[model samples]
Target: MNPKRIRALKSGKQGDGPVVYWMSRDQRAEDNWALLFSRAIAKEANVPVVVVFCLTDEFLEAGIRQYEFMLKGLQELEVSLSRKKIPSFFLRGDPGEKISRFVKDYNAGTLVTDFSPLRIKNQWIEKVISGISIPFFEVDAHNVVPCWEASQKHEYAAHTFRPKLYALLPEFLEEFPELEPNSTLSDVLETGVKALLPERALLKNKDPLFEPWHFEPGEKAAKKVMESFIADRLDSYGALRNDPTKNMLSNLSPYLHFGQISSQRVVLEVEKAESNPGSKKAFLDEILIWKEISDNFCYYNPGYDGFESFPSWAKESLNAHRNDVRSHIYTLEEFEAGKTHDPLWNASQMELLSTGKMHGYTRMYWAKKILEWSESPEKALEIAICLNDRYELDGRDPNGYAGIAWSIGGVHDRAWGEREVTGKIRYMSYEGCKRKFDVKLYIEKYS
Candidate 1:
């Protein structure tokens, strides 16, 4: 493993106890740099390495649908890690309070955790360090190009971020070292960590609109999705991926969002397939360029989801149009119910409501329409984020944040011809949908 992947969060030296991987973002045991790094540290010290997860009841805007997917993935992960002779445990409550207390209680020598650019997770690490005396480290197991190494600051757009990212891609795209079952059992297995048996508290909170849909939850399921995408869809990805009516886009975002699968693993798998060069390039752009830049945006911008995070050009234009007259306005309830004037927008929301995912082609249009109908840009953003985080399987992710920002506030996008409700932020419309893909088929399927 490259030393660049690891960064010290605390100044203290490693103590004389087991190395613990307080797993957060990267949940998979295989193809996980943080887990491998934890194992390496333990091996050098002749001690055990363990993994712990802290579960909080409240994850921003997420309900039972999101929790149901995530907890199941973690449940599968516990079995996968145990097969490699590693012990896994879970604690419930505020992650900061629970994780920091666990380190001291277990007499942990060093703490290692996977990286997340989100404010909540970073705040958890800060709280952990404040209470623990042990050496602590963070590994970028999530990104193919580590967020900090991707860029020192938030990138203006993909054109600017792309060349730099492609330059570093080769160096970081090396094969993942596979895990082998270990013969020696460390004494830490006999320690006091809760030997949790699997059935986690399932939140009974239900949404009347959302019913169970197609995506399965876990590592094995993620692998099947990956294989099928490369084998069946990759050849036509470039030509048809933008057409929402066709099932051409890779349905891998949910697994990727949960960290059940590695984007690095996806990249590696795609690289091996004999797909059309254009198709390969286009598919990789979404999975790699856009994905990494989302992490870069969240990592560097403290107010990534806020209206203030928009570029200066965007902010000025939107401010001029904040109070502009709207053709129609809808409340949160109306929006959630898809009771809007525009049938296309209603169709988009219906897709999200029914399947927990909005098509990539329609997501931008869905958010842009929200800006048009809301009283102000800020409220539009708040509503867009709330609906997205609550409904999409891939919600509460950096990509969703970045995409929402792009749709409503024009973060990575450039200013277009000045418009009414949205000002210079690029306009998306129902007519535009008709031009791009079969609007009737899309609306019919979701409606």
Candidate 2:
């Protein structure tokens, strides 16, 4: 691993106990730079290493469905780590308190953690860093290029950041070192791994507002999904990605959101595959470049998920049209229930509610319509974000926030032909969607 990937937060500390890896964003044991780095430090120190996860009972917009999905993935992770003789522990309650306590109890010499650009994750890291007295490190294991290293400030747009990434990609994108089973450790650490179940942590009553997840969870499942995508969808991505009814998408966002698989691994595999240059390039750009750009937006912009984060042009245009008459106004509840005047909009919401995912192409149409139908742009933004975070499996992510801003606030888009309820912000109508794809077919399938 490149030394540049690891950012040490504290000075060196001395201890004889094992190293502790606080697994957070990057969940999977395989292809994890943080895990590899932790083991490397352990090898040098001649001590065993253990993985600890702090599970909070509640998180923003995270219902039973999200909890179940994450718990299942973590369960699979424990089994994999056990095979390698790396003990895994589940710490409950506040992450800062639990993680710090665990490290102190174990007398850990060094602490390593995975990286996330989200503010909440950063807060937890701050708390942990302040409480612990050991040498602490954070690795940019999630992004192909480190978020801070990518650029020091918020990028204006993809055009500015894309060139930087492409130039740096060659140096940062490389194969990961294979992690061998730990031969230094003798016994597995006694932990409450079995108690960390969905039934114990998640809501028992089914939420009528959202449907159960259809996709499988865990690293094993994530790999199969990637294989299926490479075998079936890569070649047609460029031609069919914009069409909602086609099955040309990789459908790997949920996995990527949870960090079940690494973006670097995906890019490496895609590069080796045989496909048209256009299709390959298009797919790579969406997954690698676009995804990382979302992180860039959230990392530098403190109000990323709020209405205040909108660009000046977007805010001006939206506020000017705030008093415009909405042809069909609806409340957040109505939107959550998929009760909308437009069938296409209803179907898009239904897709997210029923399957925990919405078609990427349709998501833009879905958000734009919310801005069109709601009382004001601010209200529309709130409703769109609430619905997305509550239902979509990949909700509460930087990509979701950035994409919503693109659709409703024109974050990455340009001024378009002026229209009602959406002034200079780019507009998308049901008629436009009809021209792009078979709208009726999509509605029928999801509705």
Candidate 3:
């Protein structure tokens, strides 16, 4: 592991006890920078190392499906860690309060945690820092290139951030060192951490929309999917990735979104297997550069998910056309129910509803149409985010937020010719999609 990946959250005198690695964003036991670093520290101190997870049922609009998937992955992770003689535990309630208490009870000397740019996660870490009196560290185990290291400010677009990341990729994107079994486990008392299980509260109102998730949730499954993509899909990715009718997508977003797999591992595997330079670059651009840019946007921009977060030209153009008459308008209930007039738009909604994911190409169309049919830009933004966060397995992520902003507010997009409803925001009409892919076939498959 690169020492540059770890940074101190709280600099204080180290006490003499166990080291606790709070498993938050990154859930896997394998290839986790935070857990690997935690073990390294434990070896030096000759102290026990513990991995802890905090669970809450009230994570934004996440419901039963998301919770069930996350818990299932965590269960697999717990077993994997236990095999290596590392104890795994869970805590419930306010994560900050519970984690603070757990650290104090165990007389922990050092605390390490995974990184997330989400506001809620930041808040939890801040609260924990304030309540604890030990040295705290954070690791960017999520991104191949750490978010803060990639750029210190919000990137204007992929063009602006691409050079910076690609320049540093060779230095930062290295293979992971094997996590060895901890040699000292008898030194610390076991603070009771909850078992890995789904919260009963999460199961109360299960959404019928997710009868079966399109993607499985586990590290092993994620690895299998990545291998299959490299073997069968990478050759055609450059040509077919944007085609809605083709299954050329890596389909790794759900796994990546939940931190079931590391993007660095994916990059290492793909670069080794890909024979064609263009195909490899295309796939890497999406999974690496574009994905990290979303994190860069969220980490530096405080209002990332808000309406005001859109660029100035976007705000002015959208406000100028706020009252433009629409060919069709739908309420939030109508949108959620997939009651729109466009057959193509309805099919996109159905895909998200039944499969918990929509193709990236179609997602742009899906959100733009929401803007076209909604009464106002603000209403459109709300509707798009609501539907996305409520149904998509990868919802509430920086990628999802950034994509929606691009569709409705032209956040990372160049303004095009002015138009009604969408104003200067890049317009994706049903006709444009028809020319891009077999729209009727896509609609029929989902319908």
What are the models' TM-scores? 0.93, 0.92, 0.93
Rank list by TM-score: 1, 3, 2
Model 1 spans with C-alpha error above 4 angstroms: 182-208
Instruction: Give the alpha-carbon lDDT of every model.
Output: 0.85, 0.83, 0.84
lDDT of 3 by residue, 70-107 (tens): 76787788789988899988876798899889988999
lDDT of 2 by residue, 88-148 (tens): 9987688988988888888998898988778888888889888988888899899998888
- Identify the leading candidate in terms of lDDT: 1
Model 3 clash pairs?
none
259-296: candidate 1 lDDT, tens digit per residue: 89999999999998898999999998998899999999
RMSD of each: 5.0, 4.2, 4.6
Q: Model 3 Cα displacement at 154 (Å)?
A: 1.0
The 10-residue segment of model 3 with minimum total lDDT is 184-193
Off by over 4 Å in 3: 184-207
Which pairs of residues collide in candidate 2? none
Best of the two (1, 3) by lDDT:
1
